[PDB]
């Protein structure tokens, strides 16, 4: 599963999960997708390379399995092509 996508950065998160800090971005391709990382800022037109992850988690209320898809970058890159 590989994704190569062009879009604009709509939101930036300095986050934390599983005892590891991460930086995430919202890519507004209008649909959107999250890019997770292990010069890019709000408003940038970027080209992203990385593994598409479905990242399924169980909802607390509905008890349903849902996708929370993201493009992982480690191989991967994020290139500002504005």
């Amino acid at each position, epitope marked *: 599963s590989n994704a190569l996508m062009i879009g604009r950065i709509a939101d930036v*998160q*300095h*986050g*934390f*999960l599983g005892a590891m800090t991460v930086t995430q971005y919202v890519l507004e391709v209008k649909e959107f997708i*999250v890019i*997770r990382c292990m010069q890019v800022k709000l408003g940038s037109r970027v080209l992203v390379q990385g593994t598409l992850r479905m990242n399924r*988690h169980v909802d*607390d209320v509905s008890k349903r399995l849902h996708a*929370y898809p993201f493009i992982q970058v480690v191989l991967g890159y994020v290139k500002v092509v504005g």
Partner: nanobody
Framework: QVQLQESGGGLVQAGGSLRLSCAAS????????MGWFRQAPGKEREFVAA????????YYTDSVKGRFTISRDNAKNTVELQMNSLKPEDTAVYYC????????????????????WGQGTQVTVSS
């Protein structure tokens, strides 16, 4: 569109405990990470504790680790902060905040990335 309501604060003695609650109403469907923040009178607003939308990942500022516990219930749209072993240094106005960043499991650990803020509830610790 979104209203945040803090409750449960007030006055306590050193070593004592309080439980702060934050109820969220309006379009809560756009809320993800929830966090507690504080402002001592005269200083910058600072991160205390935060929790992800699914409640699987939590984060704490170093000086409240082992004393403070954050939790949430998504059916009631509330985030809670159990404050134990309180110190004079913890005296501040406490705010609950919400982030719009659409993520399930990742907790937002940066103050300026939070979008929604409540009016605040005063917490005073004396010896």
């Amino acid at each position: 569109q979104v209203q945040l309501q803090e409750s449960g604060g007030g006055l306590v003695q050193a070593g004592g405990s309080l439980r702060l609650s934050c109820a969220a109403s309006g379009r809560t469907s756009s809320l993800y990470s929830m966090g507690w923040f504080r402002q001592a009178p005269g200083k910058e607003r600072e991160f205390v504790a935060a929790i992800s939308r699914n409640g699987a990942n939590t984060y704490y500022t170093d000086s409240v680790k082992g004393r403070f516990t954050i939790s949430r219930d998504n059916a009631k749209n509330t985030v809670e902060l159990q404050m134990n072993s309180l110190k004079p240094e913890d005296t501040a106005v406490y705010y609950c905040a919400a982030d719009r960043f659409p993520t399930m499991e990742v907790v937002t650990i940066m103050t300026n990335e939070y979008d929604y803020w409540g009016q605040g509830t005063q917490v005073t610790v004396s010896s």
